[PDB]
RNA sequence: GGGCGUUAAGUUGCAGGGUAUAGACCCGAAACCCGGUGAUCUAGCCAUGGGCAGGUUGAAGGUUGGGUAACACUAACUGG
């Protein structure tokens, strides 16, 4: 993804806007690129290479989101209702 | 020599028998051809109007709920 959108996305997530590596930020990452590469796999439909990568995407962005939803329950109800996740 | 001939009355009427061509002693076909009349029944078509009580199951979809990274997928209701 491009850095000024990166810088972005640090900047609207951030701890201390420099940390790069916290749990809302790495959801937030991944969430902005599923959400912009669900446009390739509409028109492209048999990338089965990159489907791959998508899928694992999905799977680390739950990981995490779990992992918040057994740290904080209030941070996890609060993250899922900003970004816009179902459940 | 043989074949055909010679010495033997025809012709015009009228009546009659027969013949010929005409329908040819009468009645009787299926049929063929030429010219018209018919699509007020029926076959199809075109245009234009009309008719089909009632009572059933309940397809496509559409909402909502769940589910899916998003569909697909699924239950409830609506649908007709
Ligand atoms: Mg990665
Ligand atoms: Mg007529």
Redesign the pocket.
């Known amino acids: 993804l491009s850095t000024e959108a990166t810088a972005k996305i640090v900047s609207e997530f951030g701890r201390d806007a420099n940390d790069t590596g916290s749990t809302e930020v790495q959801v937030a990452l991944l969430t902005a690129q ?2 912009h590469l ?1 446009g390739h ?1 509409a028109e492209h439909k048999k990338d089965h290479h990159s ?1 791959r990568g ?2 694992r995407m ?2 680390q ?2 990981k995490l989101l779990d992992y918040l939803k057994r740290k904080d329950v209030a941070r996890y109800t609060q993250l899922i209702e900003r970004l816009g ?3």
Do not use: H
């Open positions: 599923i959400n669900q796999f489907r998508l899928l999905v799977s962005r739950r996740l179902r459940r």
